[PDB]
Amino acid sequence: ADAIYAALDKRMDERRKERREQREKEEIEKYRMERPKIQQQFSDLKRKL
RNA sequence: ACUCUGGUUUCUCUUCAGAUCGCAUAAAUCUUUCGCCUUUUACUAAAGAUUUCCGUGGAGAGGAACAACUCUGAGUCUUAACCCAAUUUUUUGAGGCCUUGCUUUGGCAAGGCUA
């Protein structure tokens, strides 16, 4: 019963799941160019260790 | 008046949604400006960006019901009584002859002769 209800809730989420998830993927990358990850900013220095 | 064309309704599913998805209209979250400010949870009201929800359209697919009933479109869209021709063709007076030029000859070109 729990699996049935969980699958039902997941199915009700498929209306815009892929659309909003690809928008999120295309939105963090827009933010990532201006604000890179902290570990990335130290990648060249880390390599020299 | 000929022949082929071949639905409508309903229940699901999968996707795409420009368009007033919707001649209607909610909520949440985030970031800014405020309003309350004393801390949550509620909020104040504008802007901006999201998400969810109540619904919607198109197309595709699969079942069911009325599957048997006809459409539309296309195809050549197919018939005789009595009545008719001076602008294009079954009633239309448009005939012939000759000259000279010219063509390897045939013929052609122009003019003349009519009745």
Q: Which of residues 9-38 of A touch strand B (CB under 7 A)?
A: 11-20, 23
Resolution of this structure in Å: 3.1
Kindly report the bases of strand B lying within 7 A of a protein C-beta atom. 14-16, 50-53
Calpha distance A22→A48 (Å, rounded): 36
- Which of A43, A41, A20, A21 has its CA nearest to residue A32? A41
Q: Can you tell me the distance from the alpha carbon of A17 to that of A6, in angstroms, rounded to the nearest whole number?
A: 15
Number of helices followed by number of strands (H, E) in chain A? 4, 0
Contacts of residues A36-42 at CB distance under 8 Å and 24 or more positions apart, as own/partner, are none
Lookup: tokens for A2: 């729990």
Element holding A31 (H helix, E strand): helix A17-34
Diameter of chain A by CA atoms?
55
Q: What is the DSSP letter of A38?
A: H
Q: CA-to-CA distance for A41 and A32, rounded, in angstroms?
A: 12
The separation, in Å, between residue A42 CA and nucleotide B27 C1' comes to: 43
